[PDB]
Amino acid sequence: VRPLNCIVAVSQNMGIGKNGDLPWPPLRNEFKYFQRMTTTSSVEGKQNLVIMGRKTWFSIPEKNRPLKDRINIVLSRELKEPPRGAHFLAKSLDDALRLIEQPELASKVDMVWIVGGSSVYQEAMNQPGHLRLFVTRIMQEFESDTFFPEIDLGKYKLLPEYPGVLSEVQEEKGIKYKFEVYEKKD
Numbered sequence: 143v144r145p146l147n148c149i150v151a152v153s154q155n156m157g158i159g160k161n162g163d164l165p166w167p168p169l170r171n172e173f174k175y176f177q178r179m180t181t182t183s184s185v186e187g188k189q190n191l192v193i194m195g196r197k198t199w200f201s202i203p204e205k206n207r208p209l210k211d212r213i214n215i216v217l218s219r220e221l222k223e224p225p226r227g228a229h230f231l232a233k234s235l236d237d238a239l240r241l242i243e244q245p246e247l248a249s250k251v252d253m254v255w256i257v258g259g260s261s262v263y264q265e266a267m268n269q270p271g272h273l274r275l276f277v278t279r280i281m282q283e284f285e286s287d288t289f290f291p292e293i294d295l296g297k298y299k300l301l302p303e304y305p306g307v308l309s310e311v312q313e314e315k316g317i318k319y320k321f322e323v324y325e326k327k328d
């Protein structure tokens with residue numbers, strides 16, 4: 143729960159969003175990976191937890207909120223109550239991270255996942271300490287208005303393998319993609 147995980151899908155031009163949606167048509171197999179990695183806790187009786195920005199929360203289809211079988215935290219400086227369906231609201235990333243480390247969640251949270259958007263990735267990546275980046279490389283260019291921060295290879299190590307993550311190039315709807323895991327210690 144102390145390591146922080148970010149998970150993202152990014153185009154060749156580092157794009158992650160366009161007009162409050164994704165730059166590419168729906169990649170349901172890519173979504174299945176997102177679901178699996180964020181939902182699968184390491185121990186029965188604990189749930190994983192997802193943190194996301196307010197725009198990402200409202201852009202997720204209503205029928206799929208909250209992200210099922212995960213504790214959902216939404217970051218907003220303007221909302222005063224958690225959005226309907228969200229488990230917690232936090233006014234800053236540090237407030238959220240401090241909440242998660244409170245003892246009355248000890249038994250109640252396994253892995254922590256940052257799931258977007260651009261804003262939130264940026265802030266998480268500015269932080270000292272142990273960060274993993276679960277990056278899906280969409281091997282194609284797409285017109286985008288929201289983007290993922292630079293991944294400095296002097297700071298992040300590309301893990302050659304990672305448990306439960308397959309390395310082969312995948313394809314759906316003629317769009318190729320592959321799964322990568324990066325790590326920054328300390």
Ligand SMILES: NC(=O)C1=CN([C@@H]2O[C@H](COP(=O)(O)OP(=O)(O)OC[C@H]3O[C@@H](n4cnc5c(N)ncnc54)[C@H](OP(=O)(O)O)[C@@H]3O)[C@@H](O)[C@H]2O)C=CC1
Nearest residue numbers: 151159162163195196197198217218219220258259260261
């Ligand atoms: N893997 C992928 O490809 C993903 C792509 N996306 C893309 O991201 C795009 C949107 O990105 P972006 O513009 O960053 O919008 P965000 O997803 O970051 O959501 C915006 C909200 O984030 C809140 N927020 C961010 N940081 C903080 C903080 N430290 N404290 C409190 N609130 C915070 C802001 O609240 P307030 O305004 O009140 O300050 C803002 O309202 C979407 O179009 C989507 O397509 C999203 C998820 C995944």
Ligand SMILES: Nc1nc(N)c2nc(CN3c4ccc(O)cc4C=CC4=CCC=C[C@@H]43)cnc2n1
Nearest residue numbers: 149150151162163164176201202206257258278
């Ligand atoms: N690997 C990876 N990592 C992510 N963080 C990720 N996030 C999403 C976000 N997403 C989704 C998040 C959850 C969900 O059930 C469906 C979607 C589908 C469409 C979406 C449209 C616009 C904005 C957000 C929304 C979709 N795919 C993703 N894949």
